[PDB]
Design a protein around this ligand. Sequence first.
Ligand code: VTH
Lengths: 237, 300
Amino acid sequence: GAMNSSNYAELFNNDIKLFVDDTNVYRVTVHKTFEGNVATKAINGCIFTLNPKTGHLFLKIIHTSVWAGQKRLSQLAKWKTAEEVSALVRSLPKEEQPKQIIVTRKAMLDPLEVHMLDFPNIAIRPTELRLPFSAAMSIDKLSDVVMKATEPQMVLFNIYDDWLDRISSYTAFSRLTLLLRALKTNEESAKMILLSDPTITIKSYHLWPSFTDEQWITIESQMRDLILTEYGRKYNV
Amino acid sequence: MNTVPFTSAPIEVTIGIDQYSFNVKENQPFHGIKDIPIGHVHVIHFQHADNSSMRYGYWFDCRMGNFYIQYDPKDGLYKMMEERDGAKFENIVHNFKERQMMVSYPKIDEDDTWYNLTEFVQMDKIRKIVRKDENQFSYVDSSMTTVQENELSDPAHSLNYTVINFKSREAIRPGHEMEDFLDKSYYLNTVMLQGIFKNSSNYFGELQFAFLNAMFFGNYGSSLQWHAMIELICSSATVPKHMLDKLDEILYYQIKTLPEQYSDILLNERVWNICLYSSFQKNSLHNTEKIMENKYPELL
Ligand SMILES: COc1ccc(C#N)c([N+](=O)[O-])c1
């Protein structure tokens, strides 16, 4: 059934599982027309498919051409997501296929279940967690590769960089979700915190800065301050 | 006009015959039901005074044989049986008709209700849903589960309705996942109508039989089947015009006949609201939508 605070360590056991987030699949800018009406213009999107144990991210870039001549795009986006996730599973060797797929939005359950009928043993699960994966496009290197795409493309990343060399997957996920929650609540302030120091560098093969352990404690503290504040600035407290 | 005689009524029981019913007292001189209209299937059903648990009954067609009811004190129920000796039956029945020991099937002349509820229901199809091939009549009760229910446990005593499952490989063509899930026309028209039922009359017959088992026995799996068969039509963008018109008539008479006090359990809010207001066929069921809105506006 549903994934929540009570079965949280299940994410870091040795059964392969993926989170699927579809928030950033169908993205538009809303604008005025010459006649003064409103129209949308789609921009490239992505499916965020993440192994929370290993950090492996399967970033399926959704090029705007996939929407050409289609109706009800927000509904199609859910089925397109499920088609691509299913195609990904089929492309993996049997021993790499997930035993569970957790969708971050319940509206993905029926599209993914239907696309995975061939895989009766893979459990499709919702979650009660409010995960901040929508902020993935606030990660500069992910945003860059999505916006530069001129065709459909899958790009593979490790969203934990090399952290698993020093910390556990539970701790890595906690750090990831803290960073992403910050970026979602106040992107400018979060980004200032991370890379405002120009003598701190992100490696070419990494997504986040190369912090020492002590600098990550400071960084993580600065993010929790940001989140609590915004939560005050937002409710006045 | 045919007759189902009874050897006796040793236990107090409410007896139903189609949509009619009457109370018989313990050891009352009751010896059966006469003037039963020929040309329709019928159902004779029972609820004991002491145990409202288990409504049960028998689907039959008097053209297929001479049937009589006898109370079995060992199994504790009224059993339908067939008399092969056509003279034992003619004489046994005539004796009871002369002594006026029978109730008359109480059809009003203007009244087409039973025909309208059983228009497409045939005994031969009943007997394939309810498998007991040594008898010409079919026993159903409140507790019997359906084949599909059993998959999710005695197979001899199951209701073998046609399995309908909207999230199944049978329902969903590879490569048409979204199309087939959101528009079930290929499942309705190719898989079910052309492939399994062969024609819409057999589809409607199973739909009507499922409703009648839900209404008369409170059979939950039959109610699931009735709603599934409605929902498959309503969720199809492409349905023959004659089928939609006939469905509207079918459902109208089912909703008309349903006890007003059983609406809460026998009607699935989600299915009816989807069928009448969201589905492709939202504007195709005028008679059904009108009676539903005037009789059960709460459900909607
Ligand atoms: C033992 O055979 C019979 C007993 C009772 C009845 C009756 N009622 C019939 N009959 O033919 O209707 C047959």
